[PDB]
């Protein structure tokens, strides 16, 4: 493998270099929002973000080493978790609001414009306040996101994935040691960060069923890529 060789600083820089860009929402339905127009904006945005995520995953150290079927399984299981932790991250210095795009910043009242949306909205805002309360660093964020990619689908199959997961643990501890945290503070913050992944998984499952409802309600037509990713959870 090629990911086990490089160091922690090299691991962080490789992850920061692979970060996908921030995409803009479509300025076309920039009027006040109905249920269909808002769901159309987020479906279009998430579809374009998916394309960059798939190319971001190929730049995750150790991800190319896996077979194609294994890459497909991990991305199928984690794609909404990865989209969500990215949305939570870029919404950090916007408390009470979710920055879907620079030109699409919403609060929980606007989330009520879609049926069943405000519940997922509040869980997302709660995750953002937790990152802010913890003062989550960008180097930590890219580590958690790579952990989600490699971990979320690993117990639905392997030994190489856990070795790369251990490498990101070593990388996480290395970052906290640089920040001056003591040993006790290092494995407490490690635990606090990883426990959030349990809640991000919960949001993904609740988001997955919510996107399945509006597929059947057919409020907005979904792209073929989104349909294939949604069908993998059924």
């Amino acid at each position: 493998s090629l990911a086990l060789s490089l160091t922690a600083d090299q691991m962080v820089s490789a992850l920061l270099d692979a970060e996908p860009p921030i995409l803009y929402s479509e300025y076309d339905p920039t009027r006040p929002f109905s249920e269909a127009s808002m769901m159309g904006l987020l479906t279009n945005l998430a579809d374009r973000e998916l394309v960059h995520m798939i190319n971001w995953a190929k730049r995750v150290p150790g991800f190319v080493d896996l077979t194609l079927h294994d890459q497909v399984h991990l991305l199928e299981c984690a794609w909404l978790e990865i989209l969500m932790i990215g949305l939570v991250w870029r919404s950090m210095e916007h408390p009470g609001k979710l920055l879907f795009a620079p030109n699409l910043l919403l609060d929980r009242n606007q989330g009520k414009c879609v049926e069943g949306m405000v519940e997922i909205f509040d869980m997302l805002l709660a995750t953002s306040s937790r990152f802010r309360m913890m003062n989550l660093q960008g180097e930590e964020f890219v580590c958690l996101k790579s952990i989600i990619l490699l971990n979320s689908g690993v117990y639905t199959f392997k030994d190489h994935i856990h070795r790369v997961l251990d490498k990101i643990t070593d990388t996480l501890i290395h970052l906290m040691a640089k920040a001056g945290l003591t040993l006790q503070q290092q494995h407490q913050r490690l635990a606090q960060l990883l426990l959030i992944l349990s809640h991000i998984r919960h949001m993904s499952n609740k988001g997955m069923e919510h996107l399945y409802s509006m597929k059947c309600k057919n409020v907005v037509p979904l792209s073929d890529l989104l349909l294939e990713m949604l069908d993998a959870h059924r």
Binding site: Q71, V72, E76, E228, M229
Partner: peptide
Amino acid sequence: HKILHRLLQD
């Protein structure tokens, strides 16, 4: 799972 196959190979 076929569209994901194409994007992963470019």
